[PDB]
Amino acid sequence: STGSATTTPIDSLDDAYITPVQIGTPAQTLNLDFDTGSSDLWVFSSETTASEVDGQTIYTPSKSTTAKLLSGATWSISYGDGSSSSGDVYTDTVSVGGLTVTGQAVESAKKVSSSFTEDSTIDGLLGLAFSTLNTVSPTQQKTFFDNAKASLDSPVFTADLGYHAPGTYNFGFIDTTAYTGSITYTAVSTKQGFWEWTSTGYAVGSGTFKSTSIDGIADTGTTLLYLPATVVSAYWAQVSGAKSSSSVGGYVFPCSATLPSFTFGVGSARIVIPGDYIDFGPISTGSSSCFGGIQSSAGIGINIFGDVALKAAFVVFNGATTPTLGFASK
Ligand SMILES: C[C@H](Cc1ccc(C(C)(C)C)cc1)[C@H](NN)c1nnnn1Cc1ccc2c(c1)OCO2
């Protein structure tokens, strides 16, 4: 089997991406944030505290003839940005782009943090990291990809995110019309539960490439590119008037600037992020100071190849016996 679904930016800045997901019988369609850095599929629901719902579409398990309470099971997740959610668990039929899993764990939120309430466009998350990170207790549950894998034509999924435009998540096949050149594959460590790999270096604009190993994670659920402070300083030094602002929380730059590109290495191959992908707009409405899309990882503890990086590439998440990652230009 295979599946194919379109993923769409939630706003004009690509602050996150949503993908439609069918849950239950008859289908209830919710727009979820596919997150290759976490491993829980959770949704706003008829059980979510009423004051914490502000415009989201909810899953109502009592209206699904295939929903079953997973007795005794609970979940609770604390995301690294400070967001959180928790609740109870059902199993139900879940379909993405025509690919169906029966008996998928659907984690129903009873509580969500204010950041989730405030994003009316995001109805929950669909985790695509390794199932070792799943938070359900006392019986840990599998991700949508792990449940589907054995049925797929090939044990893979791909991310093709757009810049200020829609893109695609595919399951079970590699669309050879969706990229240029060849796909370069690179080793993955699953020891922390992430799609963790090592970039071979970077360049700023038309500058020379610096060979250096940068260990980090391929994370569709993170908006920006988080890299070591040395690398980030070298980038922003090329932008007149850019500075690190402790009050704003990162590097800012004049909205009048034209930004240089940023290149990262994948083996001997190179992925180029155009400068415009690094502009996240005014820090507050009407300001002429703009927020940068490349930021230091120093406060987080791991480097993160988030959407700013991934949207410049066609990315293969290869779930073979030994997992690997592939990157192509597009
Ligand atoms: C933050 C997301 C998880 C999430 C997604 C969306 C949202 C909103 C809908 C409310 C917009 C909140 C949360 C990330 N996913 N892998 C993640 N989950 N756990 N760690 N990370 C990576 C990290 C960690 C720390 C950081 C960061 C990133 O950005 C800024 O500080």
Side-chain angles (χ1 to χ4, degrees), residues 1-62 64-67 69-110 112-141 143-148 150-190 192-242 244-299 301 303-330:
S1 59
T2 65
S4 183
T6 299
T7 190
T8 302
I10 66 169
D11 66 18
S12 65
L13 302 172
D14 299 351
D15 281 317
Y17 296 78
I18 51 173
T19 310
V21 178
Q22 283 70 50
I23 310 176
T25 309
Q28 301 180 38
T29 300
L30 276 64
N31 297 325
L32 305 186
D33 185 348
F34 283 23
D35 180 10
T36 64
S38 71
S39 306
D40 287 52
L41 191 176
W42 74 261
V43 297
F44 278 79
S45 75
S46 58
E47 303 175 331
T48 309
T49 299
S51 64
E52 298 177 354
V53 184
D54 187 9
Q56 294 80 10
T57 297
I58 62 166
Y59 171 59
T60 303
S62 68
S64 175
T65 57
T66 43
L69 182 68
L70 189 60
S71 184
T74 60
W75 63 280
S76 179
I77 191 158
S78 295
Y79 296 103
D81 71 323
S83 298
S84 65
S85 53
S86 65
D88 60 10
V89 186
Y90 294 81
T91 59
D92 209 341
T93 303
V94 173
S95 299
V96 177
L99 170 66
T100 301
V101 169
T102 59
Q104 174 66 45
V106 177
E107 304 173 33
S108 167
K110 294 185 159 193
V112 305
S113 63
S114 58
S115 54
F116 289 118
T117 301
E118 291 159 2
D119 269 16
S120 68
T121 63
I122 292 172
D123 304 322
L125 268 63
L126 190 150
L128 295 166
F130 293 87
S131 294
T132 53
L133 296 178
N134 176 267
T135 78
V136 176
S137 180
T139 306
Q140 190 172 58
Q141 302 293 304
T143 72
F144 176 80
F145 178 56
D146 259 3
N147 283 320
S151 298
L152 295 177
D153 290 356
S154 182
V156 305
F157 68 91
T158 66
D160 180 11
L161 301 180
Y163 166 68
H164 297 175
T168 305
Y169 282 103
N170 291 329
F171 293 82
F173 72 106
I174 290 169
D175 179 358
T176 62
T177 76
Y179 59 88
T180 65
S182 59
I183 305 177
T184 298
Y185 289 87
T186 198
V188 165
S189 173
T190 67
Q192 300 190 81
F194 303 123
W195 294 91
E196 188 174 358
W197 66 290
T198 303
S199 174
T200 51
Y202 70 96
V204 175
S206 61
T208 59
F209 187 85
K210 174 75 166 177
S211 292
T212 184
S213 294
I214 306 171
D215 178 295
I217 67 168
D219 185 6
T220 59
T222 293
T223 309
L224 305 185
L225 174 53
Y226 295 91
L227 292 173
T230 50
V231 178
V232 174
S233 182
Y235 179 81
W236 290 108
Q238 297 303 310
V239 179
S240 297
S244 184
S245 168
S246 61
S247 65
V248 174
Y251 281 88
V252 299
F253 68 93
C255 295
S256 60
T258 302
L259 296 177
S261 64
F262 184 90
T263 301
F264 64 95
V266 181
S268 59
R270 305 290 179 254
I271 301 294
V272 179
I273 304 170
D276 287 354
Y277 291 27
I278 299 158
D279 186 344
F280 281 74
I283 60 172
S284 294
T285 307
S287 180
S288 71
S289 182
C290 275
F291 198 68
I294 296 178
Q295 298 292 346
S296 179
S297 65
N303 300 307
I304 307 176
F305 293 86
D307 299 334
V308 163
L310 304 181
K311 79 180 76 175
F314 178 88
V315 187
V316 181
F317 294 80
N318 172 27
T321 303
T322 298
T324 66
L325 276 168
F327 293 81
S329 295
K330 67 186 184 191

